[PDB]
Amino acid sequence: HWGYGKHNGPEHWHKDFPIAKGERQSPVDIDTHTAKYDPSLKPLSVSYDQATSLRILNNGHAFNVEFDDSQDKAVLKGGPLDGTYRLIQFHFHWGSLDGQGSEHTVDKKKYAAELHLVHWNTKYGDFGKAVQQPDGLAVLGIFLKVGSAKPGLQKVVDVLDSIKTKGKSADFTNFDPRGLLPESLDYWTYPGSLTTPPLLECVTWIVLKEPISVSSEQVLKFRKLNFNGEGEPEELMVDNWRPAQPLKNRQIKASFK
Ligand SMILES: CC(=O)c1ccc(S(=O)(=O)NC(=O)NC2CCCCC2)cc1
Ligand SMILES: [Zn+2]
């Protein structure tokens, strides 16, 4: 099936998933100087107090921390969003080296990695139905650079030896994702897509300006992960990112001057 190699990589995806060359594909380059401050943007409300992690999954693409999205416990609202969006999962995309890994770029700049806190609109009832809708998902994009450790990322780093290969999963309760947030909620926003197949055009994107600092050792653990399944030739999970896509008929709004 699809992957990130020479033969199944992003440039091959359009064959099985035509929308890949569609009209609102993610990620994009964020031209910070082309983006308009939008006064009419309401403030971003990130309400992660009752957030309930359950499991961590290696799906052979990335790893997902899954949350109990059976009630309004950890929600994204305000900003550009109309209604309430439930956190289902977060995952990263990262590089073979520190000079790459991010999917979104800022004035063509690539970060070491990028966090997707994935939420779905509660008016659609569930995630599968939400991705069928243009306003179905809100993804909170956060850039990772290498420097200081993120203390609140270490619990996730420590358990990754337990989910080394495709398919493997671990109980992962009580993780507080507020420890992955930067200081500032300043953000760009655009209409966009899932960045992997099926690349559905169901995403309101919210990328924070302020990156979080992770340690080289924290990112080195992500790179020790495996695309392949247990008992298979070792392919290291690195450069699991989609390059920037054509902006087409889209304006990127900013929450700040
Ligand atoms: C753009 C973006 O953030 C996003 C892309 C795909 C999906 S999905 O297809 O609904 N999720 C998964 O089942 N897999 C996950 C995701 C892709 C890597 C981590 C693993 C969810 C969010
Ligand atoms: Zn993602």
Chain centre to alpha carbon of residue 162:
22
Question: How far is it, in rounded angstroms, from Cα 27 to Cα 49?
Answer: 29
Question: How far is it, in rounded angstroms, from Cα 26 to Cα 232?
Answer: 31
In whole angstroms, how far apart are CA 241 and each of 8, 106, 144, 178?
A: 13, 15, 13, 24
How many separate helices (H) and strands (E) can be counted in the chain? 3, 15
Residue 39 preceded by cis peptide, ω within 30: no
Question: How far is it, in rounded angstroms, from Cα 42 to Cα 44?
Answer: 7
Q: How far apart are the first and last CA of the chain?
A: 44
Phi then psi for residue 209, to 5 deg, are: -65, -45
Q: Where are the domains of the chain?
A: 1-257
Residue 251 gets which letter from DSSP?
-
Contact 199, 193 (CB under 8 A): yes
On the CB side of 63, CA atoms within 13 Å amount to: 28
The resolution in Å comes to: 2.6
Q: Is 61 known to be catalytic?
A: yes
70 contacts: CB under 8 Å, gap ≥ 6: none
Chain centre to alpha carbon of residue 106:
15
Closest ligand to residue 102's CA:
2
Question: How far is it, in rounded angstroms, from Cα 100 to Cα 81?
Answer: 30
Question: How far is it, in rounded angstroms, from Cα 166 to Cα 20?
Answer: 24
* Best probe residue, ligand 1, of 86, 91, 115, 208 (max atoms within 8 Å of C-beta): 91
Closest ligand to residue 88's CA:
1
* Best probe residue, ligand 1, of 116, 127, 143 (max atoms within 8 Å of C-beta): 116
Give the residue from 153, 157, 160, 213 showing the smallest Cα distance to 179. 153
Residues within a 6 A CB radius of ligand 1: 26, 59, 61-62, 64, 91, 116, 118, 139, 194-196
Question: How far is it, in rounded angstroms, from Cα 185 to Cα 207?
Answer: 9
Q: What is the CATH number of domain 1-257?
A: 3.10.200.10
CA of 103 to the centre of ligand 1 (A): 13
3-state secondary structure of 108: coil
Strand pairing report for 169-171 and 53-58: antiparallel
What atom in ligand 1 is closest to the CA of residue 26?
A: 1
What atom in ligand 1 is closest to the CA of residue 57?
A: 20
43 contacts: CB under 8 Å, gap ≥ 6: 78, 79, 185, 255
Q: Given the residues 7, 61, 104, 119, select the one marked as catalytic.
A: 61
91 labelled binding-site residue: yes
93 labelled binding-site residue: yes
Q: Identify the residue whose C-alpha is closest to ligand 1 atom 2.
A: 194
Phi then psi for residue 169, to 5 deg, are: -150, 150
